[PDB]
């Protein structure tokens, strides 16, 4: 859920109050306190670290783009022609918080960063492969509301094709992509714009004002970290006197994963019939790398004998 | 357990054999094959990555070292005397494999590296703290046998002490340490010293010799990665045609975590009775950092009022 830090601070203050006065020397804060004696706006959250869980179970892809180039040789000699595709697609991510935080119900500003994520995938023959994908992720620790982000990828596939005389070669670019749900831990460090240092530094999560408002006293992170019902997601006191909270996001990513080119040869005088179909030797991944076409089609690799 | 890769390769070869001859073109390998037709010694394991799980549940410490320095002022004036401790201790780790690998029962050579590990700990008042510890870890992917390593740490604690006339101040260094069980995933990449490339590169896990031994054929990682009973710990085929295996270690670490100094004041003419006990303002961590003494003793921090 979205934890309110103002409430928890108020719960901690009201727990320590009658027992040690929150370490404040003197004063009549009238416990329990009302949310007017308090201003938690001085609390800072470190910009969150996003830790993707690395997907392990291979997924099925489907065709998200197909296009064609036509190469013709109506000459007397074998020609060397290059097939060149350049296609921009857009990887899309939408992200909701499962376990987030705010301070006094506030809604913070959506942030956006690049995250490397593991993408295990199933080639067309059912072959199993492993790659990584870099994408833009938007997140908001303060709502469950989905935050969208987008990333532009260009697929550049170029290679030479050997076209015989009076043949037509048709090159078909196919882009395979899928839909992945990546859960990520979301990591933040609770600090403050103000400290009660003096012997060593302690973030002040809130000054506690007297009911008449004349004087005040500081509420230090020490009392928050050692509060016996501090929730499960808060870490212990760091060397810093800061406290780490670890929340959660669930992200959904929709990305092209790999591209192949298929060649189909025809004789220019009957274009109804394929003479010869073959694949480019390499499929191209989202991240630009080249892998063997056997990893993603129904052909197994193959070798002759070696007679020593 | 310790998986033998020679067996699994042999199981894969004997699975594919009758079906496609392991992609080898021609030849009568007599399936099933015996372990003489095969030499898996060409298989390489990438030097393992060790991924520590970050301990979350705070632990109790005990006193692993205590020593004293005695400061005396038998002069007429307040003196400024520095107390200086330099103590070498040794962090010890012992590590056994839960899920490891070898090739044909071989026992590889124990390796040793520095790993940063999370150490949550309970101060003397029951306060909860978070630090990190860098230690040497020895591991062997091929046995369950414990591998020990050791790391030398110096504790340097120096500060000035204010000693009144005709007082004795006794400074007591206390080092608190504990015993932590860190489980770690162990990560390796199966490659080969030999490749059947030719269209793209495939590690050869083993040449398969004819029964008469005249000729042979290569067994490529493709057949291993797509073998329907490949075990659960192997990842899919990487872009590299390598296969990632992820095993496990369980490590036990015994380390000092923090040091404090307590001062006890006496009058030099009765040394049976403490006048005044107080702490150095800071405890010192294993990694050299300084944290407030309140995080690790039974004293809560404290502030006066501020009258605006």
Author numbering:
A (entry chain A), B (entry chain A): 2 to 309
Provide the authors' original text about this structure:
The structure reveals an elongated predominantly β-stranded structure with similarities to other bacterial β pore-forming proteins.
Recently, the structure of the closely related Cry51Aa1 (1.65 Å) protein was published. Also, Cry51Aa1 and Cry51Aa2 proteins crystallize in nearly identical tetragonal crystal lattices and in the identical space group. Substitutions at positions 93, 95, 147, 149 and 251 reside on adjacent antiparallel β-strands in the region adjacent to the putative amphipathic pore-forming loop (residues 112–140) and define a second region within the Cry51Aa2 structure impacting insecticidal activity. Finally, the R273W substitution resulting in increased Lygus activity (for example, Cry51Aa2.834_15 in Table 1) is located in the tail region of the molecule and may promote interactions with the target cell membrane due to increased hydrophobicity at that position.
